Ligand binder design. Structure first.
Ligand SMILES: [Cl-]
Ligand SMILES: [Cl-]
Ligand SMILES: [Cl-]
Ligand SMILES: [Cl-]
Ligand SMILES: [Mg+2]
Ligand code: NA
Ligand code: NA
Lengths: 157, 135, 135, 158
């Protein structure tokens, strides 16, 4: 079949009534930029594995989406991030859960896949593994956005 | 939650999923996103899947692998497997959400049972499509 | 790793799995044991399964759910599904280990591809069977 | 069909050349006692969920098996325990991973299933969830055995 990418930024009660067109266009612009990067990479012969890794890295970086920068807040006003990546060729997979000090969880998941004999790492052990492989330690504060903090406050007000 | 699925020019499938979880989450809760076969699955023999929704139901129903198994063992088309999982099985267990999927034949599906799913797709060298709401 | 599967007098299936992991484990590594569909699965429509072996391969292969899906969608017997997963699919991915399984009809299987698996089983009101090594 | 239980205590390189019959009989006796307890519970009309929970609790308690008491040691001479339980009737499941201060991980997994809307809890968050619901905090060293410590020392030489 012909090379192809699909992406998502989350399913749920996305309210047309609560949205302006300018708000909608910010999401459309972000989705279109990321799917266009993936299409160009596929056209240029990049692997499906590298394409999904880069697309999810960009969705993490985008503050509009609940992954990486723009992560929702827990009950404790913390961030806990999780990611997985799987290669359909080898059936290798890598995953992290409960990480707070890694900017791009999908890149930590890819590190588990490519630079360990393991599939899944959690918490501080996952972080220490990633740091030992030279991944940068960040403050969990880097993920915080006013939009998501106000959503936490609205849920408990 | 965010995700991506792809089929490359070599015929390889891959999937990835990433999340911050839920607003006001109980610390230590794990949803489907990091769990192979729940929120993320890829197999060149069948499909690449990334999910988003009510994590617990996607785990209990192994949603991503269930798409693969319905196609591989049940002989369902991608469209038939997506309808069965997203529109029948997940709702029956009280789940909401959707997923994105690409099969080994290059068919793409973006099913969801919610009001919206932020989504986009495009074939290599072709024009991309974006969506938020239901068609 | 340890586990149990049962079929009760009301026709209900259940499964449980518990582990300390591996000697000299990398702190924070998670194997198949706590992952629904990998190390533990139960569904009254098909089978209850508890696994033990190479955690990474049992996750990648979704071993416990794969037994269920091969039976439910593929129409395989419990014995055929267990042979396919434990003796063919897991070794093809470099996996070693075994599992215990009971189907909704009360058939029991204790497949393993290793030198041993500590195991026992018995029908209510009968003498149990125990084993360590291969037959 | 008839009510039935199966249990396991782990698969791997169990070497007969290195074992005596008396050593083997300790494992056979432990397996037989636990499967017999499960058979008697099933005969009495106990639920499959209660039977697998109790069988795995007993395998945790038994120092011979790598779960609960008798857990293997990590690289750092710690214990990290994981468990799952699933009800085939409701398709509900509960799981914990990376817990060090809970005597019976399978009981913590059942607590996630019954006393939360969740399926999986990890690490300190899982422990705090259990402690907030009256499950006892135990010394992380209660699981330690000489046999498994000696196996760590042997692993460190390979
Ligand atoms: Cl739209
Ligand atoms: Cl197969
Ligand atoms: Cl034997
Ligand atoms: Cl072996
Ligand atoms: Mg066109
Ligand atoms: Na983001
Ligand atoms: Na034990």
């Amino acid at each position: 079949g012909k090379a192809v990418i699909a992406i998502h930024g989350g399913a749920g009660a996305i309210s047309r009534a609560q949205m302006s067109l300018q708000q909608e266009l910010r999401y459309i612009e972000a989705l279109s930029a990321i799917v266009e990067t993936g299409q160009k990479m596929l056209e240029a012969g990049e692997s499906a594995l590298d394409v999904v890794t880069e697309a999810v890295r960009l969705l993490e970086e985008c503050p509009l989406f609940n992954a990486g920068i723009g992560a929702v807040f827990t009950r404790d006003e913390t961030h806990e991030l999780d990611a997985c990546v799987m290669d359909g060729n080898t059936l290798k997979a890598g995953a992290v859960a409960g990480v707070s000090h890694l900017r791009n969880p999908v890149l930590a998941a890819r590190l588990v896949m490519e630079q360990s004999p393991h599939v899944m790492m959690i918490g501080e052990g996952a972080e220490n593994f990633a740091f030992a492989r030279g991944m940068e330690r960040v403050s969990p504060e880097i993920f915080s956005t006013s939009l998501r903090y106000e959503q936490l406050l609205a849920a408990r007000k | 939650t965010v995700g991506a699925v792809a089929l490359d020019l070599d015929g390889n499938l891959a999937a990835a999923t990433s999340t911050g979880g839920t607003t006001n989450k109980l610390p230590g809760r794990v949803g489907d996103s990091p769990l192979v076969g729940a929120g993320c699955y890829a197999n060149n023999a069948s499909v690449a899947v990334s999910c988003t929704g009510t994590g617990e139901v996607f785990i209990r129903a192994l949603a991503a692998y269930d798409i693969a198994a319905l196609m591989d063992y049940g002989g369902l088309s991608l469209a038939e497997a997506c309808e069965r999982v997203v529109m029948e099985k997940l709702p029956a267990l009280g789940g909401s959400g959707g997923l994105i999927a690409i099969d080994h034949e290059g068919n793409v599906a973006l099913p969801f049972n919610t009001e919206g799913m932020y989504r986009a797709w495009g074939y290599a060298g072709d024009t991309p499509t974006t969506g938020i709401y239901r068609e």
